[PDB]
Paper text:
ICV, however, has only one major surface glycoprotein, the hemagglutinin-esterase-fusion (HEF) protein, which possesses all-in-one of receptor binding, receptor destroying and membrane fusion activities. We also solved the crystal structure of D/OK HEF, both in its native state (resolution of 2.4 Å) and in complex with its receptor analogue (resolution of 3.1 Å), and the structure of the enzymatically inactive HEF (resolution of 2.4 Å) alone and in complex with two receptor analogs respectively (both resolutions of 2.2 Å). Indeed, our results show that IDV HEF is functionally and structurally similar to ICV HEF, but with some distinct characteristics.
Thus, we designed the enzymatically inactive HEF protein (HEF-mut) containing S57A, D356A and H359A substitutions, and expressed it using the same method as wild type protein. For the IDV HEF-mut/receptor complex structures, interpretable electron density is observed for all the three glycan rings of 9-O-Ac-3'SleC, including Neu5,9Ac2 (9-O-Ac-Sia-1), galactose-2 (Gal-2), and N-acetylglucosamine-3 (GlcNAc-3); while for 9-O-Ac-3'SLN, electron density for the first two sugars is well defined. But the majority of the interactions between ligands and IDV HEF are made by the 9-O-Ac-Sia-1 moiety, whereas the glycan portion of the ligands do not make significant contacts with IDV HEF, except for a hydrogen bond between the Gal-2 of 9-O-Ac-3'SLN and S173. Compared with the ICV HEF receptor complex, the 9-O-Ac-Sia-1 of the receptor bound to IDV HEF displays a very similar orientation. The 9-O-acetyl group of the receptor docks into a nonpolar, hydrophobic pocket, formed by V275, F229, F240 and F297. The acetyl carbonyl oxygen forms a hydrogen bond with the hydroxyl group of Y231 (ICV HEF: Y227).
Numbering used by the authors:
A (entry chain A), B (entry chain A), C (entry chain A): 3 to 193, 197 to 429
D (entry chain B), E (entry chain B), F (entry chain B): 9 to 157
Amino acid sequence: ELICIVQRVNESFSLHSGFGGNVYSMKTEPMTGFTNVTKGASVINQKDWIGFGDARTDLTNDQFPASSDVPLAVAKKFRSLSGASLMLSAFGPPGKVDYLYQGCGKEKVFYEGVNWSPEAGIDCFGSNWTQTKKDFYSRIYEAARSSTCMTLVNSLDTKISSTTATAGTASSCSSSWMKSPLWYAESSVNPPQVCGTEQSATFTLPTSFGIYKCNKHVVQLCYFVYENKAKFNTFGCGDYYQNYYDGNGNLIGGMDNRVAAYRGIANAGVKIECPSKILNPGTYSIKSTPRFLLVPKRSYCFDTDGGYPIQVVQSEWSASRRSDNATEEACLQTEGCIFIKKTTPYVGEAADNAGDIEMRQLLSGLGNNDTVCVSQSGYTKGETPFVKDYLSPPKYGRCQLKTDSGRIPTLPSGLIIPQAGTDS
Amino acid sequence: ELICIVQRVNESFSLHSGFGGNVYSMKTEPMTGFTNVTKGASVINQKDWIGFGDARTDLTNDQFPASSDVPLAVAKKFRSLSGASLMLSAFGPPGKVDYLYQGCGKEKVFYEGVNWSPEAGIDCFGSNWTQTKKDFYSRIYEAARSSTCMTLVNSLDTKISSTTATAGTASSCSSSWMKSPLWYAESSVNPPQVCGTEQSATFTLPTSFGIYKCNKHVVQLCYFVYENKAKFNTFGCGDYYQNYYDGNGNLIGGMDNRVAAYRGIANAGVKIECPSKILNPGTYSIKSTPRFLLVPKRSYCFDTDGGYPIQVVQSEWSASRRSDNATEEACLQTEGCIFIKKTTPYVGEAADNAGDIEMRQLLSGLGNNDTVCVSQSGYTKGETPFVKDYLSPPKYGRCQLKTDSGRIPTLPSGLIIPQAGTDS
Amino acid sequence: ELICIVQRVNESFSLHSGFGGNVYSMKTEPMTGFTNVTKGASVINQKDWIGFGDARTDLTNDQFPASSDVPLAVAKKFRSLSGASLMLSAFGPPGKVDYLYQGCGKEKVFYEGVNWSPEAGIDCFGSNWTQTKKDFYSRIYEAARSSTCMTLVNSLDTKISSTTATAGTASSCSSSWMKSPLWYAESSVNPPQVCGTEQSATFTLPTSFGIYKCNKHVVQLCYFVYENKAKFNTFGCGDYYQNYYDGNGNLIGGMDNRVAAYRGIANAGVKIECPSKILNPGTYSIKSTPRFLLVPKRSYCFDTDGGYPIQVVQSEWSASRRSDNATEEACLQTEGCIFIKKTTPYVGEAADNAGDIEMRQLLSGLGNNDTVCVSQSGYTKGETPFVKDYLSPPKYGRCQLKTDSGRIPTLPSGLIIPQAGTDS
Amino acid sequence: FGLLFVGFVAGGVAGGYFWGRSNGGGGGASVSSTQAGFDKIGKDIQQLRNDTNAAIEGFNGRIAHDEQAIKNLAKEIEDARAEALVGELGIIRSLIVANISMNLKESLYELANQITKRGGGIAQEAGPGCWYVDSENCDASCKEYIFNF
Amino acid sequence: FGLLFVGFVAGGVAGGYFWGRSNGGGGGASVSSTQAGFDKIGKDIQQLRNDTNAAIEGFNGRIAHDEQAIKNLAKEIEDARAEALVGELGIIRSLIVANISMNLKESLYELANQITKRGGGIAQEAGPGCWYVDSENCDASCKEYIFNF
Amino acid sequence: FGLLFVGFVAGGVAGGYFWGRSNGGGGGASVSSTQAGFDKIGKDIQQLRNDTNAAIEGFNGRIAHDEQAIKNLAKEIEDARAEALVGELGIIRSLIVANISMNLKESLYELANQITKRGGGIAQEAGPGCWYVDSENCDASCKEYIFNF
Ligand SMILES: CC(=O)N[C@H]1[C@H]([C@H](O)[C@H](O)COC(C)=O)O[C@@](O[C@@H]2[C@@H](O)[C@H](O)O[C@H](CO)[C@@H]2O)(C(=O)O)C[C@@H]1O
Ligand SMILES: CC(=O)N[C@H]1[C@H]([C@H](O)[C@H](O)COC(C)=O)O[C@@](O[C@@H]2[C@@H](O)[C@H](O)O[C@H](CO)[C@@H]2O)(C(=O)O)C[C@@H]1O
Ligand SMILES: CC(=O)N[C@H]1[C@H]([C@H](O)[C@H](O)COC(C)=O)O[C@@](O[C@@H]2[C@@H](O)[C@H](O)O[C@H](CO)[C@@H]2O)(C(=O)O)C[C@@H]1O
Ligand SMILES: *[C@@H]1O[C@H](CO)[C@@H](O[C@@H]2O[C@H](CO)[C@@H](O)[C@H](O)[C@H]2NC(C)=O)[C@H](O)[C@H]1NC(C)=O
Ligand SMILES: *[C@@H]1O[C@H](CO)[C@@H](O[C@@H]2O[C@H](CO)[C@@H](O)[C@H](O)[C@H]2NC(C)=O)[C@H](O)[C@H]1NC(C)=O
Ligand SMILES: *[C@@H]1O[C@H](CO)[C@@H](O[C@@H]2O[C@H](CO)[C@@H](O)[C@H](O)[C@H]2NC(C)=O)[C@H](O)[C@H]1NC(C)=O
Ligand SMILES: *[C@@H]1O[C@H](CO)[C@@H](O[C@@H]2O[C@H](CO)[C@@H](O)[C@H](O)[C@H]2NC(C)=O)[C@H](O)[C@H]1NC(C)=O
Ligand SMILES: *[C@@H]1O[C@H](CO)[C@@H](O[C@@H]2O[C@H](CO)[C@@H](O)[C@H](O)[C@H]2NC(C)=O)[C@H](O)[C@H]1NC(C)=O
Ligand SMILES: *[C@@H]1O[C@H](CO)[C@@H](O[C@@H]2O[C@H](CO)[C@@H](O)[C@H](O)[C@H]2NC(C)=O)[C@H](O)[C@H]1NC(C)=O
Ligand SMILES: *[C@@H]1O[C@H](CO)[C@@H](O)[C@H](O)[C@H]1NC(C)=O
Ligand SMILES: *[C@@H]1O[C@H](CO)[C@@H](O)[C@H](O)[C@H]1NC(C)=O
Ligand SMILES: *[C@@H]1O[C@H](CO)[C@@H](O)[C@H](O)[C@H]1NC(C)=O
């Protein structure tokens, strides 16, 4: 008698091909899957990142940790002071807090800016500080993107040619003036008999500041804005001009009304504009109308040793105060910048404006040790190489790829029967 | 008795190795091969491309389809008018057709230009329109390369300072003048007693035009060319100058003879040069000699949302007319531009200059639904990953790679015998 | 009786998994390994490279081959003359050797420069030739990086406006002057009664030179440096200025003291600075103070057809002479430049300064036919795809990757037993 | 028909591994049981399936480093990279399926081999998973001993 | 010598699959036929070859998206990409050749198995593709029945 | 236990390939020799190991062209490329190990097959590497002839 083990399959069995043997099975299981994506900020390397902030990441605040959007361990990685902002430190307006931001980190988190919003009510002849704000942070983010470190330079070497010129003061600026730019005025220029002499100055951007190497400087090349030359001739002879030159004489900034049209707003009066520019280290010259001279007195120093795309955190007040979205729009138009944004209003635990539940959730990733990818869509762990939807750029690290779930191959499971040869 | 199936091979059999079993066979067949390459223009995505043209792609022409180099379905994808060209619309010379080119498409086909060739005989003090042509299309192609859309801006906001200056007219320009630039002249400047006053003007490049976002503008910063200052002092006091400034006063174009040498051709007389520049949106200033002022009045608006390398089609007359190859050379020197060129003369079916058999063959690919790669060598389908010769750049899509036919591995065929173990 | 072959393993046997069968073995051997890296210079393509040098690669030197750092076959691939240097040929100082360097090669070796070091003692009002040296070679290396060929252009077409101006001579320059720039002086300008007339000149950078296509030119836009305007008014009326303009009037170089601060060193006297710039072909204008005019008379012509990262060889004297490391620092700050450096002093076989054992070892690779990768770490052959340590950039060719030795998988060796199924 | 072949059955009829017998009276007329106590096979299947984790973890552990500063998704490049990764995954899949097939087939050979040595040399092998027993040497309780059904 | 071995033959002499016999008088002296009616093998070969299309189509269907704005061919990069693709193709080739070999060998085992069960248990297997028949049990027309040559 | 199985042994006890025997008096009590003259296996192992060079040379011969003008190492990109190459190498490894295993196993089948045809049909196969000899047909010098130990 012939006795045999017999192999049989049903209509329920489907054939799975292999290189060196096929398999019949009734069930399949996907071979792998998608990795979750978490919204908010994080880092891929806990030992090489730096944060810059204000009260909301300042562990020395009287109301810590109720006033904090991050736990202690994360706060230690921040350079923050209550009331501070990069922009506040750039200009140093009267009575505002003046923190010397400095640090190194290939990954960078900017969670600051709200302390100079429209709510601040800083005047100082400002044409539009919200515009100045957007322009300033744009330059910062661009420079920070390719730098390992950043430091405020709280005082540039400066020299003016005039011996009669004196320090400027304005009723609109707390009867004082900015730390930067410095304001020098000639009291004798009166459009009677006197026109005075053209003012001159130099300012130097250093090659270093403390332990920090400087390859690039963000500075403001400010100028005054009048609405017409008739309106200007209330103060100075001829048109207004304030021009900025490098060492050789190449015009690099300023406003010259000998050739450019006036654009002062109707009956607004005198305004100041302060566009930020990225300049190399060196000595720079200034030529201006006799009565008024503006000279840059601070900068932000960056290197070019490289860095990762940066993360910028929404910096706005609670609903009761007047905010702006300048750092958002600065970030959006700047390559290599990732913006983190709340979907609900800011409601603080300490007071109205510090200690928000949503932001704490969004910033919680800054304390994780297993983040491998950071993107504009959020951050991931290293589970699989795939995600259900694209990770939007900017992004860096071991970043997952989008594929349809249907293209993920399966493996046989359940009852299984091997097959080889043609069987016919 | 021992009875066995015996396996034997000849000298004709060669051994093919495998991971998990070898194979003896007499014949081999290549595993895959090369994909054909077709010369001419095509697209990888029929739902996202745009064409700009003239009569040869204008379905409204009286002699359609005899006057067309493309079938109806392809013509519907073109923005074309008989007699038109991008350059014609840029300047708007007297009596020429003035089509408002506008459209969106990540893939772009430029089949236009012939309508302003030397055959046109347009003078208007033109120093060398063929040179202007090459320069104009260069700027267009560069800007189009990184833009999704394009539109003519048929009228810039402009304002001149002078109240006495009047519109310019020339016997060499049909007793009229271009639409762009505008020409303003002061009748009172006579090198007797009068020198007049320096002329001023502003022109604005908008941030948008209709539904089209503008990130970049192609404009002409024209200036007059005299051969020497003595020759210029027949019209104006001092040297000639026409300078272009941005909002701050940075010189961005024009011709200033206070510092630059004259380069007017000997006894040629007055000539006009119109180099094209790519400028950001904003308000721009002009300073010129008292008697003559040139002001840009049109532009081409582009975005920076991105696009594919563009395709430019040879735009020349039949042999009987005077053509140029300016768009060819514009394309050749511009990154991301692919040029399509006939090997035989243009012989039209409608008349001499419209409806060519070769061009129809070369443009036939614009109606295909299965093109995966477009290159300077031609286009391909998705048959194999390989081609016999390189696909020359620029190129985009699923593009094949060159490999020698000998490096394409083979598979055993014909009578086949399996082999495993050492058999010894 | 049942008789069986029995398979057994020890504790010494470890299981190695396979796709279609496992293997027991006692010993393993790594599947592959690291490729050695050799310090020094080499090439991946012996038929497309060019060297530029001095006596140390000059086969026509009286003491060859004792005076050579390369063998004959390699020397034939160099364009060298004893006593020469790129910089010497750029300026052509009195009594120095003036070699017309020219050649083509996608791979480039620069072994030259030492012949104009501080040891040369060339004065000619030089502010700091070491600084000029570093700046000059920086421009050369940047331009060479993207060029296939290079040639000295030993004479630019030049024209000065003045008819009274005459050729300049200086006691500090061997009672003569450089070949480039040319020096033109007006004898009649005396700060008594006479101020003279502003001087003018043009120089043309050609589109070609001999068989060499020119897309880019390295030229010096020299200017004189005074310490203050009072010190300048010993020679000229008003401030010093020497400005460089392109065809349209855009300032591209020079020193203008009407707007820029003086930076002459205290009581140093008159100095000349000669920064090098990369300029397109065309005609350029010059405006200067009446008494002194400087005009560029030479250039280095490059194409933009592309090239590989270049190799620059340390060019210093023996210890007894005064050297610099300007070409080293030029190379270090220039993208796509690879620097080759000795670790011991230069000790020549011919004389003190020619024929060094270490350099011969470092340059020996220039004669190899099997180099596949060239890097800042040295060069490799095509043994394996791996190296123990990173190959530092710049680099090009079939370049190995760093991986830990532990990540290199192994294969079973020694006594081997196959295993399949679950065996239970 | 014996371990080298897989057959199909219609309608109901369970699939899997069964005992089959042939002749007797001349000519006989088939017979197939309804599956024995092949718990070895079920256990081996379990082990083989779990052994695939190694190959899968190798794939999951490998994620390419990237850095993009760009603000707009490069969709076509993104999709190409995914397609290439899916291609690799497909090859690994085909390797795994074959590795299961070969090792299950071998495990089945190892089951049949134990049966041969259980009734030795009563069994008499007729290719893998098939035997010739002379219903003279072996009663019904011996066949019950040898084949365990 | 029986399905585990492949032998070589010189000069003319057709290659392929043949019937071989051994002893008789003691000692015998070989004999190899000139191929039987193994149309099964020819048919299986045909099927196996056509089954390779799946793996080939998978490869052909995969083409990386690119975008180059550059005007001059980057020849070295172009060649490197091709070389990598050819490398992948070479691995697939080695997988396919083995997949053919293993499945043909199995198909041959399945042919020999049918022969065993045709003369059962007259056949008596001596390794794959080899049998011991006692020229007492089987005439010449029985061997003709069992081995069909 | 016969070529489909690999067993473990403790302490000392050499590993490898040995001759094993079973019953006799009823019931018997095992026995395993101390390895015969399987120099064929040693020779086959040598050949199979050397045959791996082909696959290794294929891998070593493939090095991607690159060009970097950058002055600072892009460490993360450098490491990613290595990791991908190591991944490929790991797949080739798994292919090679299996290719050795399958071809060694086959070589072992080819050894056992020669033994079967040496004492034919005295041998009587009981799965690969196992035989049933009736210690009536075969003395001790016949078994010595057939199994060579
Ligand atoms: C440095 C200086 O000039 N300070 C006086 C300023 C200043 O001159 C004017 O603002 C000029 O404005 C500029 C920058 O162009 O003026 C001060 O008094 C002003 C007065 O000039 C103005 O007419 O009326 C203001 C009252 O609303 C104001 O008082 C000032 O701005 O405070 C006095 C400064 O000392
Ligand atoms: C706007 C204007 O000036 N129109 C008159 C022009 C024009 O002034 C001149 O071309 C100046 O040329 C420039 C642009 O520098 O001249 C017109 O008459 C000219 C005449 O000036 C010239 O001497 O002779 C020409 C005849 O060949 C011609 O008639 C003109 O160009 O038509 C009259 C314009 O009204
Ligand atoms: C072309 C020219 O001017 N040559 C004379 C030079 C030269 O004018 C001065 O250097 C001006 O320097 C510049 C370039 O600004 O001067 C020569 O004589 C000088 C003399 O002027 C200076 O006071 O004393 C020097 C002695 O140490 C020297 O003799 C010169 O430099 O040789 C004569 C040139 O003919
Ligand atoms: C290896 O070869 C086998 C046999 O040629 C292939 O098996 C075929 O697989 C397809 C499904 O892809 C089935 O429709 C056929 O019926 C199978 N043929 C046989 C004879 O079973 C198998 O696909 C190949 N392996 C790979 C990875 O391609
Ligand atoms: C798998 O292993 C086998 C056996 O070691 C290799 O077969 C050898 O192949 C070469 C040709 O490449 C022949 O010259 C040898 O004679 C073969 N050896 C034997 C014993 O047949 C086979 O190459 C390996 N597979 C792969 C893909 O490398
Ligand atoms: C192919 O499948 C076999 C069997 O499932 C795998 O063998 C296992 O390998 C691991 C080591 O990786 C051992 O610990 C197990 O004991 C093995 N199982 C058996 C039953 O022997 C093998 O790893 C698979 N091949 C690959 C390349 O993953
Ligand atoms: C084909 O056979 C399989 C297995 O022999 C059947 O699968 C069983 O289905 C029932 C009900 O759906 C489950 O409870 C069992 O668990 C399944 N078997 C196993 C081993 O899990 C299948 O239903 C059969 N199909 C047809 C159409 O008859
Ligand atoms: C080796 O054997 C093969 C097949 O046994 C021979 O191939 C045959 O060649 C003839 C004439 O060239 C063809 O008509 C047949 O079609 C081939 N066989 C098959 C199956 O197609 C080959 O000629 C033999 N070579 C030598 C040198 O004897
Ligand atoms: C397990 O068995 C192996 C081989 O049977 C033993 O390997 C031998 O070790 C000795 C001494 O170390 C060597 O001289 C031999 O050359 C090895 N054998 C071979 C074939 O090369 C191993 O020592 C055994 N291990 C234990 C713990 O008993
Ligand atoms: C099953 O696989 C996992 C790997 O995820 C392993 O940790 C576990 O030990 C395995 N179980 C068995 C019984 O082998
Ligand atoms: C052979 O392969 C092709 C795939 O190109 C398939 O369409 C066809 O059905 C196959 N033929 C058979 C008989 O399997
Ligand atoms: C062993 O492999 C090498 C390949 O490196 C080959 O040259 C040599 O001939 C091989 N030896 C044998 C005996 O096959």
